[PDB]
Design an enzyme around this catalytic site. Structure first.
Site, PDB file in Angstrom:
ATOM      1  N   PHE A   1      94.600  79.468  82.451  1.00  0.00           N
ATOM      2  CA  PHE A   1      95.866  80.089  82.794  1.00  0.00           C
ATOM      3  C   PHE A   1      96.818  79.786  81.649  1.00  0.00           C
ATOM      4  O   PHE A   1      97.048  78.625  81.309  1.00  0.00           O
ATOM      5  CB  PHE A   1      96.408  79.532  84.112  1.00  0.00           C
ATOM      6  CG  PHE A   1      95.692  80.057  85.325  1.00  0.00           C
ATOM      7  CD1 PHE A   1      94.368  79.712  85.576  1.00  0.00           C
ATOM      8  CD2 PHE A   1      96.336  80.921  86.203  1.00  0.00           C
ATOM      9  CE1 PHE A   1      93.692  80.223  86.686  1.00  0.00           C
ATOM     10  CE2 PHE A   1      95.672  81.438  87.314  1.00  0.00           C
ATOM     11  CZ  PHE A   1      94.347  81.089  87.555  1.00  0.00           C
TER      12      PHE A   1
ATOM     13  N   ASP B   1      92.260  73.618  81.350  1.00  0.00           N
ATOM     14  CA  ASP B   1      93.630  73.816  80.880  1.00  0.00           C
ATOM     15  C   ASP B   1      93.544  74.429  79.481  1.00  0.00           C
ATOM     16  O   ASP B   1      92.602  74.153  78.736  1.00  0.00           O
ATOM     17  CB  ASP B   1      94.371  72.476  80.815  1.00  0.00           C
ATOM     18  CG  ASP B   1      94.805  71.973  82.186  1.00  0.00           C
ATOM     19  OD1 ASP B   1      95.183  70.788  82.287  1.00  0.00           O
ATOM     20  OD2 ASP B   1      94.782  72.759  83.157  1.00  0.00           O
TER      21      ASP B   1
ATOM     22  N   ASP C   1      95.976  74.152  76.886  1.00  0.00           N
ATOM     23  CA  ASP C   1      96.534  73.354  75.792  1.00  0.00           C
ATOM     24  C   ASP C   1      95.554  72.250  75.404  1.00  0.00           C
ATOM     25  O   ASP C   1      95.849  71.054  75.474  1.00  0.00           O
ATOM     26  CB  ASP C   1      97.904  72.783  76.193  1.00  0.00           C
ATOM     27  CG  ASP C   1      97.852  71.937  77.455  1.00  0.00           C
ATOM     28  OD1 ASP C   1      97.113  72.289  78.397  1.00  0.00           O
ATOM     29  OD2 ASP C   1      98.575  70.922  77.508  1.00  0.00           O
TER      30      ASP C   1
ATOM     31  N   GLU D   1      95.784  68.372  91.428  1.00  0.00           N
ATOM     32  CA  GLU D   1      94.870  67.287  91.084  1.00  0.00           C
ATOM     33  C   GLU D   1      94.683  66.318  92.244  1.00  0.00           C
ATOM     34  O   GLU D   1      93.592  65.781  92.451  1.00  0.00           O
ATOM     35  CB  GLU D   1      95.394  66.547  89.856  1.00  0.00           C
ATOM     36  CG  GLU D   1      94.587  65.330  89.459  1.00  0.00           C
ATOM     37  CD  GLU D   1      94.978  64.816  88.089  1.00  0.00           C
ATOM     38  OE1 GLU D   1      94.548  65.423  87.083  1.00  0.00           O
ATOM     39  OE2 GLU D   1      95.728  63.819  88.016  1.00  0.00           O
TER      40      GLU D   1
ATOM     41  N   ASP E   1      92.114  62.280  75.197  1.00  0.00           N
ATOM     42  CA  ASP E   1      93.382  62.389  74.486  1.00  0.00           C
ATOM     43  C   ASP E   1      93.314  61.263  73.467  1.00  0.00           C
ATOM     44  O   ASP E   1      93.595  60.104  73.783  1.00  0.00           O
ATOM     45  CB  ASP E   1      94.570  62.161  75.422  1.00  0.00           C
ATOM     46  CG  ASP E   1      95.905  62.423  74.741  1.00  0.00           C
ATOM     47  OD1 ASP E   1      96.018  62.163  73.524  1.00  0.00           O
ATOM     48  OD2 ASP E   1      96.846  62.880  75.424  1.00  0.00           O
TER      49      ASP E   1
END
Ligand SMILES: OC[C@H]1O[C@@H](O)[C@H](O)[C@@H](O)[C@H]1O
Ligand SMILES: [Cl-]
Ligand SMILES: [Cl-]
Ligand SMILES: [Hg+2]
Ligand SMILES: [Hg+2]
Ligand SMILES: [Hg+2]
Ligand SMILES: [Hg+2]
Ligand SMILES: [Hg+2]
EC number: 2.4.1.40
Length: 272
Positions: free
Chosen positions: A64, A138, A140, A230, A253
């Site tokens: 999305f 996701d 990003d 979540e 990350d």
């Protein structure tokens, strides 16, 4: 296709698995309900690629991209082309409020992309006829290494990179009994990410349907789960055990967590 007559594998030459030699001695590679936990070194991708190709497997990847998030599509798609299910049929589904803003990314053969404007004129019934598995992530993010058929199974969740070594009491589950996502301090297997889950179309739709209804009940009760979707995903996977669990290699990350020795590969990461 999925759940059908499976033809024989061809002759293959690879190292014999060693019964008395553990795969990994530093991590748990199977859950208490016998679902494999996917870490580098636990799978022979050649065997798995054969198994899924012989089934003419098609994987749908959904994202999305709303508002300013459309700016992440180019890198996301370009890197997916280099690392996601290469060799297999892939159908990207980009849900966005800015159709004309979707970048023209060059795709390899057997891979296609559909832009759905958003809520939308897309009926989930279509997924059932277009793909065998659905992977929901996701936008990003960027792929940095192999993410293949080793993740495919009826239902899978991914270990949140910030809690894989934490005790259940520290998990940020919704702790209010008034919420449908409620999970007490003495319950819980792992803390899964809302940003990377999937499975067969049927199982994914069951999960999203359950969470949609659970969130509606909470809304009517005037409560919003601490971590929204979540939180509900964690409640769902607690009560419906996933058939595979992906290690943090699958959503990391590096800026916030570095590169621990336990991670032999960083496959899908957040963009700085
Ligand atoms: O504790 C759960 C939270 O952990 C954060 O690190 C993450 O940015 C959030 O999206 C949520 O997953
Ligand atoms: Cl998603
Ligand atoms: Cl999605
Ligand atoms: Hg191994
Ligand atoms: Hg999805
Ligand atoms: Hg749920
Ligand atoms: Hg939901
Ligand atoms: Hg959910």
């Amino acid at each position: 296709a999925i759940g059908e007559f499976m033809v024989s594998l061809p002759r293959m030459v690879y190292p014999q698995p060693k019964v008395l030699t553990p795969c990994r001695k530093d991590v748990l590679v199977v859950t208490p309900w016998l679902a494999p936990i996917v870490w580098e070194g636990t799978f022979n991708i050649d065997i798995l690629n054969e198994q899924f190709r012989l089934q003419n497997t098609t994987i749908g990847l959904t994202v999305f991209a709303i508002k300013k998030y459309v700016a992440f599509l180019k890198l996301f798609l370009e890197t997916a082309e280099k690392h996601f299910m290469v060799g297999h049929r892939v159908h990207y589904y980009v849900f966005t409020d800015q159709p004309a803003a979707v970048p023209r990314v060059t795709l390899g053969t057997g891979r296609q992309l559909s832009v759905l404007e958003v809520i939308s004129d897309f009926c989930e019934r279509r997924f059932l006829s277009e793909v065998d598995y659905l992977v929901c992530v996701d936008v990003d993010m960027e792929f940095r290494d192999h993410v293949g058929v080793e993740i495919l199974t009826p239902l899978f969740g991914t270990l949140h990179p910030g809690f894989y070594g934490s005790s259940r009491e520290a998990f940020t589950y919704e702790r209010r009994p008034q919420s449908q996502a409620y999970i007490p301090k003495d319950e819980g297997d792992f803390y899964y990410l809302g940003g990377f889950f999937g499975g067969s179309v049927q199982e994914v739709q069951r999960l999203t349907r359950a969470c949609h209804q659970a969130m509606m009940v909470d809304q009517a009760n005037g409560i919003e789960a601490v971590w929204h979707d979540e939180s509900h995903l964690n409640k769902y996977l607690l009560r419906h055990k996933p058939t595979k669990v992906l290690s943090p290699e699958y959503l990391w990350d590096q800026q916030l967590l570095g590169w621990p020795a336990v991670l032999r590969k960083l496959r899908f990461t957040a963009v700085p």
